[PDB]
Structure 1
Amino acid sequence: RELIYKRGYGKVNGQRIPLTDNAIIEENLGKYGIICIEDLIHEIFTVGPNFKQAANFLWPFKLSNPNGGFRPRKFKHFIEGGDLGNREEHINALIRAMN
């Protein structure tokens, strides 16, 4: 929700357009039943039949550096004590710092 609401940009005709209105989402994804930002969030979160189209419509999110920083050495795996790899549910704290 927070990623889509704060850093949500659609790829409209090759341009990065902020998602400030439901009209943009309906215009670019209405053929798939997605006509609102809540529809886009639902499709992404539930991995619906049009997840490919929704995710590709979303311009790649451009996050800031985490507010609390990284671990002391961030280029090891999360298991080793770094930040790389799969941290599973623990990416939510990283997203909250980075977003």
Structure 2
Amino acid sequence: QRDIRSAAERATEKEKRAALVKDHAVKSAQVYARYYIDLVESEKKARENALKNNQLYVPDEPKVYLVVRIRGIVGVAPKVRTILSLLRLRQINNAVFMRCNKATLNALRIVDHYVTYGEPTVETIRNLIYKRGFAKVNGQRIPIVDNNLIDEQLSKHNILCAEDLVHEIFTCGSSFKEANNFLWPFQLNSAALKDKRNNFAEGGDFGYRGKYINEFVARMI
């Protein structure tokens, strides 16, 4: 890419863009804090109102999972190897985000005994991105330390700072694919297990954990 404008014009436009990004960041942070609080309160109110009327309130199903690889690379069957390659889980103790459909769920079930997964919270997502966040730019692994990089690479999808990225991941918005692939897979610290050989349901370790993924990973960030 070749730029025609002089150095001073670039400097001035860069400063203008930075100011715009800062303002957007402040506004979005306030808005999203309000949104999270409101979500929790509305769910509680729905539960109470339904309860008075001899009815059960069934909440929404999880839309995004957090899956982490817990088994190594020696002696792996071919189909499992392919599926794990397509999730970008090529090393032990790596982690990624994943949208939920029947297409993705069936593949996850096939690779079950190599991973553990569940539904994350906003706090987990924010900690992961702030402390272990790196960007894939032209095939390089670039650290994320400020909102300028996010704005430069993801502006065309209305993503201008860390708050928008967190919100897009949590809500599984219309730009989940680009935002998710913009992130390099997380390289976490070593994992504390109970028994790598068996499913979480029967006291083991692999498979579906639900909300306990949050503590399991909080130990690792």
Same fold (TM over 0.5): yes
Specify the structure having the higher radius of gyration (Cα).
Answer: 2
User: What does 1:1-99 correspond to in 2, within 5 Å?
Assistant: 1-66=126-191, 69-71=192-194, 73-99=195-221
Report the equivalent of 2:28: none
Aligned partners of 1:10 and 1:18 also within 8 Å: yes
Gaps spanning 5+ residues in structure 1: where?
A: none
Distance 1:29 1:76 in 2: 41
Identity among equivalent positions (%) equals 55
Aligned partners of 1:65 and 1:97 also within 8 Å: no
Distance 1:28 1:83 in 2: 38
Q: Cα distance, 1:65 vs. partner?
A: 1.3
Q: Cα distance, 1:83 vs. partner?
A: 1.4
List, as ranges, runs of 4+ consecutive aligned residues in structure 1 with deviation greater than 2 Å: none
Distance 1:4 1:59 in 2: 10
Write the deviation string for residues 11-67 of structure 1: whole angstroms up to 9, x where unpaired: 11111111111111011111000010111111101111000111100110110013x
Say how many residue pairs are matched.
96
TM-score (norm. length: structure 2): 0.42
Q: Cα distance, 1:75 vs. partner?
A: 2.7
TM-score (norm. length: structure 1): 0.92
Distance 2:198 2:159 in 1: 39
**Root mean square deviation, CA, Å:** 0.9
Q: Cα distance, 1:94 vs. partner?
A: 0.7
Amino acid at match of 1:8: G
Q: Cα distance, 1:76 vs. partner?
A: 1.2
Q: Cα distance, 1:98 vs. partner?
A: 1.2
Distance 1:53 1:82 in 2: 35
Q: Secondary structure at the match of 1:20?
A: coil
